[PDB]
GROMACS .gro file of C-alpha atoms in nm:
model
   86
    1UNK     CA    1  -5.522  -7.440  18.996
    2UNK     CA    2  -5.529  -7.519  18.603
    3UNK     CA    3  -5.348  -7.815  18.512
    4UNK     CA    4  -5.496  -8.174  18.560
    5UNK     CA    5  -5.755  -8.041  18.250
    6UNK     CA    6  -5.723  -8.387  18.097
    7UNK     CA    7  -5.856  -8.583  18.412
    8UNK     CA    8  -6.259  -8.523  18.546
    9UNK     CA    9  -6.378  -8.832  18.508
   10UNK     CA   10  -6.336  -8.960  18.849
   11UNK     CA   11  -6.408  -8.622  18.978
   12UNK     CA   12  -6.715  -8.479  18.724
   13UNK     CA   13  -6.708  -8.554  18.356
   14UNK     CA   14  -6.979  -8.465  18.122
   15UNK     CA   15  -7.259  -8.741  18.294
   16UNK     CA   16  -7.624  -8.738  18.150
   17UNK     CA   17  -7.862  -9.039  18.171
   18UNK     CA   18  -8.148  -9.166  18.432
   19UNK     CA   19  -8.084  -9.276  18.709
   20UNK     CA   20  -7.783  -9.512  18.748
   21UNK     CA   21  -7.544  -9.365  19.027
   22UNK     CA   22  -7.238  -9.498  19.157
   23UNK     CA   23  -7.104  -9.284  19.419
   24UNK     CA   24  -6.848  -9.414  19.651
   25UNK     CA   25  -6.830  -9.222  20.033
   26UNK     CA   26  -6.780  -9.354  20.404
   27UNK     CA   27  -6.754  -9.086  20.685
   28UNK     CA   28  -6.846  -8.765  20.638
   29UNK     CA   29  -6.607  -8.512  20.804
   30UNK     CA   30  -6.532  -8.228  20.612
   31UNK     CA   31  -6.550  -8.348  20.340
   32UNK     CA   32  -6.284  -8.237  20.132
   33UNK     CA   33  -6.258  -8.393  19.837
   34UNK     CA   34  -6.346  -8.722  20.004
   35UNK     CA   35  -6.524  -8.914  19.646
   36UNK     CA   36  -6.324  -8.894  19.349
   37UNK     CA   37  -6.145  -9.214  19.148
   38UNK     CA   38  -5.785  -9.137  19.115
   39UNK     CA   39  -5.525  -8.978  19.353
   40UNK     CA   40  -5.712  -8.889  19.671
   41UNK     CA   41  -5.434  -8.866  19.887
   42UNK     CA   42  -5.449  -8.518  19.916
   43UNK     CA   43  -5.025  -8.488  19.898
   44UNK     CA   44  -4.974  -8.175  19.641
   45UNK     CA   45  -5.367  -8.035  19.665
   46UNK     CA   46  -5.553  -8.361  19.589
   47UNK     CA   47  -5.435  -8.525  19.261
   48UNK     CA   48  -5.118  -8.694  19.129
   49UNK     CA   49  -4.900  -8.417  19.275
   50UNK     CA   50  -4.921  -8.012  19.234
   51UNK     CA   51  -4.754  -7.729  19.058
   52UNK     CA   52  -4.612  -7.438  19.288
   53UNK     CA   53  -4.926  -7.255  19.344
   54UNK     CA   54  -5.135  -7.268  19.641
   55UNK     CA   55  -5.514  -7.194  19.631
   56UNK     CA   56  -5.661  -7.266  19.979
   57UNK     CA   57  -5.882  -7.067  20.166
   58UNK     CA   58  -6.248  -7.012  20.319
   59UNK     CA   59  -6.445  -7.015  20.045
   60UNK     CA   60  -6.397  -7.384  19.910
   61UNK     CA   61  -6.628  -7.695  19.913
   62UNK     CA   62  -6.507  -7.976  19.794
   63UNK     CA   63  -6.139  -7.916  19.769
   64UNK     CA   64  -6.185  -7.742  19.422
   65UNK     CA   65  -6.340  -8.080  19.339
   66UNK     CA   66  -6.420  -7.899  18.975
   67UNK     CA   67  -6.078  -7.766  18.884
   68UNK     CA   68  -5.933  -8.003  18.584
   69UNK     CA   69  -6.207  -7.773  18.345
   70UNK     CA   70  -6.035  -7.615  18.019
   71UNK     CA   71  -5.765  -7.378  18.215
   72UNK     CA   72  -5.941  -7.067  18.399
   73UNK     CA   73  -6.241  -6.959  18.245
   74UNK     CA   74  -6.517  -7.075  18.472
   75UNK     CA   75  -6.616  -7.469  18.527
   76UNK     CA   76  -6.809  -7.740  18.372
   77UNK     CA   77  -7.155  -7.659  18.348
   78UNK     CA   78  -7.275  -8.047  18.486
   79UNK     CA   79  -7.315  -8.104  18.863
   80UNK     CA   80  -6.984  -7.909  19.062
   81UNK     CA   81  -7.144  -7.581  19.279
   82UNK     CA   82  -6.846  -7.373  19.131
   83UNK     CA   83  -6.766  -7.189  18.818
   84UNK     CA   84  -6.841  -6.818  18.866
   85UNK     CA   85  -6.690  -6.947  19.171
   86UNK     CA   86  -6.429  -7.144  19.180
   0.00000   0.00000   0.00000
C-alpha cells in the first residue's frame, strides 16, 4: 500500500522485552488480518479507509498485516513474515 506509516502499534511496532504478551484472537478462519487494535473492519483494505490502489492477491498472509513501515522499501525487521516480501 504505503500510507498508514504513522500507525503499527496495534498491528507490529518496535516490541522487545520477556515475556509479557497480550494478543487478542477468537476464531481462526482465514485469518486475515483478524488481531490488530484499530480499524479492523476491513472496509478500504483493513484500516481507517484506503487510497485508490488495490494490492490483493495469492501471496498474502495476514492481510499485509506489516504495511504502515516507512513507504516501500521492505518492512520492519521485528516479528511480520514479510519484507523482501511484502
Amino acid at each position: 500500500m504505503d500510507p498508514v506509516d504513522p500507525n503499527i502499534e496495534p498491528w507490529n511496532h518496535p516490541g522487545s522485552q520477556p515475556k509479557t504478551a497480550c494478543n487478542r484472537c477468537h476464531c481462526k478462519k482465514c485469518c486475515y488480518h483478524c488481531q490488530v487494535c484499530f480499524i479492523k473492519k476491513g472496509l478500504g483494505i483493513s484500516y481507517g479507509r484506503k487510497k485508490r490502489r488495490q494490492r490483493r492477491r495469492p501471496s498474502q498472509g495476514g492481510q499485509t498485516h506489516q504495511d504502515p513501515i516507512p513507504k516501500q522499501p521492505s518492512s520492519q525487521p521485528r516479528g511480520d513474515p514479510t519484507g523482501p516480501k511484502e
